[PDB]
Structure formats: C-alpha cells, structure tokens
C-alpha cells in the first residue's frame, strides 16, 4: 500500500515477467497444430436493421419502387452517418 516502493516494485516485476514471456514465445521452435472464442455483438446496441424503400423511373414510362434491407450493422453505421451529416450540411 506504500506506493513509494510498492507501486514501483510491482509494476517493474510485472513488466519484467511480460518481457520474459514474450521472449519465450518468440524463441519457441515448438510446432503448433493447424476463430478463437470471442464475445458476439448484437446487430448494434438497439438490435435493429436498416431498410430503404426508394422510387425510380424505368425506360419508356414506369415508376417502380425498391425496398432494400441492410442487416449489416457496419454498413448501417457508415450509411446513417452520411445522412446525419448531409442533414446538417444544408
């Protein structure tokens, strides 16, 4: 609890141990056998997906509407961020 030496000593010993472990891992000629478990994020914090109905005009005369759903939360974030920016860009 005496940071003067306790904090300095423990931090130094931890750093030395980490360095020794890294050196041992680098020096191993042991052959390892041919994705590690990770937390799986939900489709965003809100658990939502992004859809988009949209109108266009075909050759001759037509007015078809396309509804497209984006379930990729990565595509979502980048998509929305531009609109919110373009909404403020006016």
């Amino acid at each position: 609890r005496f940071s003067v030496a306790e904090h300095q000593e423990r931090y130094k010993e931890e750093c030395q141990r980490i360095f020794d472990l890294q050196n041992k891992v680098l020096s191993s000629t042991e052959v390892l056998s041919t994705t590690a478990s990770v937390t799986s994020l939900n489709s965003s914090a809100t658990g939502r997906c992004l859809k988009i109905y949209r109108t266009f005009r075909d050759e001759e005369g037509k007015e078809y509407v396309r509804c497209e759903t984006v379930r990729k939360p990565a595509v979502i974030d980048a998509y929305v961020r531009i609109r919110t920016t373009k909404d403020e860009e006016f």
Binding site: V25, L26, S27, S28, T29, E30, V31, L32, S33, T34, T35, A36, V38, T46, R48, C49, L50, K51, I52, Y53, R54, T55, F56, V65, R66, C67, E68, T69, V70, K72, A74, V75, A78, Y79, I82
Partner: protein
C-alpha cells in the same frame, strides 16, 4: 522515377522445392527455362511450372508483416521491402491463418487481438449509390421476422 520492388514468398511442394533449391544454388540460366510463373487474371490463382510440370497456386495474405533486410557488414541492416503475400503451390480462402516461422502458427486465431481486420465500407458506398435513386424511403426497427 523509382517503383518500390514487390517481393513475395513462393511455397512449393517438398520434392519440387528440393529440385528448385538445387537449381537455384547451382546458378545456371538452365533454371530460368525450368521455373516459370503464370498469374491468372483472378489475381489470386496461378500456375507455377517446375521442370515444365504444372502446379496449382493461390496467392494468399499472410497474417503478420515481414520485411526484407539487406546488409553489407552484418551489423547494420537496411529495410528493402515489405512482404505480405505468399504464392502457395500444390476472400476467406485467400487469407492464411498461420505465420511462416514455427512459433507463429494460427497467429491469426490465438496470438492476434480481435479488434477487427476489414468489405463493410465498399458495401456502404454501393448502398449510397443505390440510395441516390429514391423519392419515398421506408426504414423500421424490425424484430424476430
């Protein structure tokens, strides 16, 4: 101008690797006729022909980054290029999980932090391009559907 040289690693089957190694250490131009490399317009597929025998190749991405370092006195080493690709001969398939050295195997699965790699943004660009043609847009929360 100067263009940075592009070095990659070629991995061969072990008998063909022994013949290519013997022909390289010999040093004649006979090796030049014997060893050819044809890279297909896929960009991730090829043939390596050892002694006119075709072998099927894939250009894969390596999980670590290697750097070639040349020297004249073996005390100071100058970085010459970055190596990140290997033309193993015999997308997710074009990514190699293991590293070249023995301590690094499946470095991607175990010794790599899983912050992220990359795809999602090219899809975003395509989505914005499709969005451009819109008059009435409809988007909702969505649940278990």
């Amino acid at each position: 101008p100067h263009e940075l040289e592009s070095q990659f690693i070629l991995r061969l089957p072990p008998e063909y690797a022994s013949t290519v190694r013997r022909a390289v250490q010999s040093g004649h131009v006979n090796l030049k006729d014997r060893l050819t490399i044809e890279l297909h317009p896929d960009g991730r597929h090829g043939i390596v022909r050892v002694d006119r025998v075709p072998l099927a190749s894939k250009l894969v991405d390596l999980p670590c980054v290697m750097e070639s370092l040349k020297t004249i006195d073996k005390k100071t080493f100058y970085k010459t290029a970055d190596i990140c690709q290997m033309l193993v001969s015999t997308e997710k398939k074009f990514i190699w999980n293991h590293g070249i050295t023995l301590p690094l195997k499946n470095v991607r699965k175990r010794r790599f932090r899983k912050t992220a790699k990359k795809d999602v943004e090219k899809e975003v660009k395509r989505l914005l391009s499709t969005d451009a043609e819109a008059v009435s847009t409809r988007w909702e929360i969505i649940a278990e559907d």
